Amino acid sequence: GAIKVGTWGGNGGSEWDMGPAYRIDSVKINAGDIIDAIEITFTRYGLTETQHYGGTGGEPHEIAFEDGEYIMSMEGHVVDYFGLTIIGKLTLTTNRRTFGPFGAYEGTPFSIPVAEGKIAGFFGRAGSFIDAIGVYLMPN
Amino acid sequence: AGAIKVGTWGGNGGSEWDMGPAYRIDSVKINAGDIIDAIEITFTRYGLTETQHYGGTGGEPHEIAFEDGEYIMSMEGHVVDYFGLTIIGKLTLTTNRRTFGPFGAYEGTPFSIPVAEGKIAGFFGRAGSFIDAIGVYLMPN
């Protein structure tokens, strides 16, 4: 019933799945050389929730979405990080702003620009880092 | 009408084209040599089956006729520099049963659309002599 695109990344870590949200309120990405973590605050069915995926490392970067602001694209790199296949660079683009790039490693690029509709949530794999990531797509 | 469109990947040249979403994709023909010259899709929507060709007249053709219950679940390829133009140099379509491609010989910046849940139901992009850019419509299964 859902539209899920991904994942991009490795087979390490544990599977995680935020599910789609009615509204994404804010995102925090922790990154150093690679993407350590992603945290999302979102609202659905009248309730707000915060979910954190990944480890404790990296410098934090946060965006609080404006009213009418939605995620239009995600892009990054799947990298080799000391033998691990993980997310090394990540950017989220909204209808108004660019959030990123964060991370310093490159490898195999991926990009998911949404010409019609929106990125409504995320899924992926994580342990100490973000091993893999994917998106839920919903109509606008 | 609540469509979900992802893309485009490719250059800014060529003229825009858009097949729209289809009820069923019947067949796809890709013409390729060094790069992706053309894509032709036969699809059904509202009791009508039609064929639309995008791109030029070059390259060798290859075709897939979809089986009953067969749907597209992935698209991947390369955005490349071809004599200074930025176009699609390699393309593959993967169904729940078969891999169609890869076609084309040039590499550059890879792109990939793995559909974990749902299907690719149509295409849009830019084209002139070749396929400058490509994108897809998505639907649930």
Author numbering:
A (entry chain A): 3 to 142
B (entry chain B): 2 to 142
Give verbatim lines from the article.
A BLAST protein sequence alignment search revealed a candidate lectin from Musa acuminata ssp. malaccensis, which we term Malayasian banana lectin (Malay BanLec). Like BanLec, Malay BanLec has a β-prism-I fold characteristic of the jacalin-related lectin family. To assess binding of WT versus F84T to HIV, we conducted surface plasmon resonance analysis to determine the binding times to, and binding avidities for, the gp140 trimer, which is made up of uncleaved ectodomains of the gp160 HIV envelope glycoprotein trimer. The results show that F84T and WT Malay BanLec, which like BanLec exist as dimers with two CBS per monomer, bind with high avidity to the gp140 trimer. That is, we asked whether disruption of pi–pi stacking in a structurally related but distinct (only 63% identical at the amino acid level) jacalin-related lectin, Malaysian banana lectin (Malay BanLec), would reduce mitogenicity of the engineered lectin without abolishing antiviral activity.
Between the two CBS, as in wild-type (WT) BanLec, Malay BanLec has a tyrosine at position 83 (Y83), but instead of a histidine at position 84 as in WT BanLec, Malay BanLec has a phenylalanine (F84). First, we aligned the structure of WT Malay BanLec to that of WT BanLec. The structures are remarkably similar, with a root-mean-square deviation (RMSD) between all atoms of only 0.517 Å. However, the aromatic rings involved in pi–pi stacking are arranged in a planar (sandwich) conformation in BanLec, whereas they are arranged in an edge-on conformation in Malay BanLec. Malay BanLec treatment resulted in greater BrdU incorporation than did WT BanLec treatment at concentrations up to 10 nM, but less incorporation above that concentration, which may be due to cell death triggered by excessive mitogenic stimulation. These results indicate that Malay BanLec is indeed mitogenic, and highly so as it is even more stimulatory than WT BanLec. Therefore, Malay BanLec, like WT and H84T BanLec, does possess antiviral activity and perhaps has more potent activity against certain strains of HIV than does either WT or H84T BanLec. We would expect Y83 and F84 in Malay BanLec to interact via pi–pi stacking. Thus, although Malay BanLec is quite a different lectin than BanLec with only 63% amino acid identity (differing at 52 of 141 amino acids), it is predicted to have important structural features in common with BanLec that make it a suitable candidate to engineer in a similar fashion, with a view to reducing mitogenicity while retaining antiviral activity.
